[PDB]
Design a protein around this ligand. Structure first.
Ligand SMILES: Nc1ncnc2c1ncn2[C@@H]1O[C@H](COP(=O)(O)OP(=O)(O)OP(=O)(O)O)[C@@H](O)[C@H]1O
Ligand SMILES: Nc1ncnc2c1ncn2[C@@H]1O[C@H](COP(=O)(O)OP(=O)(O)OP(=O)(O)O)[C@@H](O)[C@H]1O
Ligand SMILES: Nc1ncnc2c1ncn2[C@@H]1O[C@H](COP(=O)(O)OP(=O)(O)OP(=O)(O)O)[C@@H](O)[C@H]1O
Ligand SMILES: [Cl-]
Ligand SMILES: [Mg+2]
Ligand SMILES: [Mg+2]
Lengths: 112, 112, 115
């Protein structure tokens, strides 16, 4: 099993959620985060008026899935989160050694 | 060492925190998140107009512990977070390769 | 690749961000979190009833970098986040098996800059 952690634009997140649900990926945890990327470099200026590059709001999605589903999930998120402009985000694939379902105590892919 | 990431009901979280503390697991990081599970399937209705399944508030607990403490901490969270209804949450066990204590630079199980 | 997850004081986060940026680490994801550590033990004093130890606001920084950058980034965070009091934070190094750039679909060696 792997944890897929994707940082996506808030405007794209509804489309990412719907693309996952259509393919039966219902379990997901979402956090409001802020981030920056390469765009902007060290500093910006406008006016002005020189400023740090701003940490701007993004949506973090975490979805833990079976190893065989990882590339399907990655593509569903990429196709739905993409816009073509800097700031579209990244997806990190993190190993998960086990999962426990709190309601029943079930572990393993069973737990997903 | 392992990172234990548990998504639990907000109403149960204070019981989880107290169960951990009673056994001397004091360090922990908590985030307000939103999530859905399998309950609801692809969509719901009510007096609609069908509606998406709502992402609802949950609490994310992250606790990094030595490997020999993982099973104990999983039991403390399962017992304290349980209600028996869908939405009780899941626990993910994620490998950690190292830990550093910022105050002193100490690494390894020592840093915990 | 590794995910470096650091929990630091909010007062020090601007210095951490500046330290990273000065060395060219620009990609980062930050979350407001709350935490406690060992300080306070099982309960606090006042008044005159006991109170639980409070979960207080912190800043969580996640930065994913190539393996050859991990020690550099750790030192940049420790040296900018340090104050010398309990509550300074911890850094967790977590394996990452792959990274995908959404804009381009690149992965692996092409998904993070070489620093
Ligand atoms: N190395 C990283 N570690 C942690 N989070 C990152 C990293 N890189 C990007 N992110 C997150 O992804 C969000 C969008 O980053 P992205 O890489 O799309 O922007 P960019 O570098 O400006 O774009 P591009 O590479 O297309 O020019 C960031 O605001 C941050 O939340
Ligand atoms: N595969 C997953 N990946 C990430 N987060 C998940 C996943 N499954 C559940 N969660 C998180 O756990 C919370 C509770 O999910 P839970 O699994 O308890 O719900 P359910 O599937 O409806 O019920 P149950 O598993 O008892 O049948 C979710 O709202 C979400 O935050
Ligand atoms: N084992 C842990 N797992 C997850 N988060 C932790 C853990 N230990 C500390 N943290 C996070 O780091 C923050 C600061 O904790 P820190 O360890 O610096 O405090 P302390 O234990 O009181 O101090 P000291 O270690 O210097 O005595 C916590 O509030 C929490 O957010
Ligand atoms: Cl993680
Ligand atoms: Mg980038
Ligand atoms: Mg479930």
């Amino acid at each position: 099993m792997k944890k897929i952690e994707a940082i996506v634009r808030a405007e794209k997140f509804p489309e990412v959620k719907a693309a996952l649900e259509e393919r039966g990926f219902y379990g997901m945890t979402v956090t409001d985060v802020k981030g920056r990327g390469q765009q902007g470099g060290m500093q910006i200026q406008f006016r002005g008026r020189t400023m740090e590059v701003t940490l701007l709001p993004k949506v973090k999605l975490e979805i833990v899935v079976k190893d065989d589903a990882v590339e399907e999930v990655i593509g569903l998120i990429v196709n739905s989160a993409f816009t073509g402009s800097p700031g579209d985000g990244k997806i990190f694939i993190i190993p998960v050694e086990d999962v426990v379902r709190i309601r029943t105590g079930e572990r393993g892919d069973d737990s997903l």
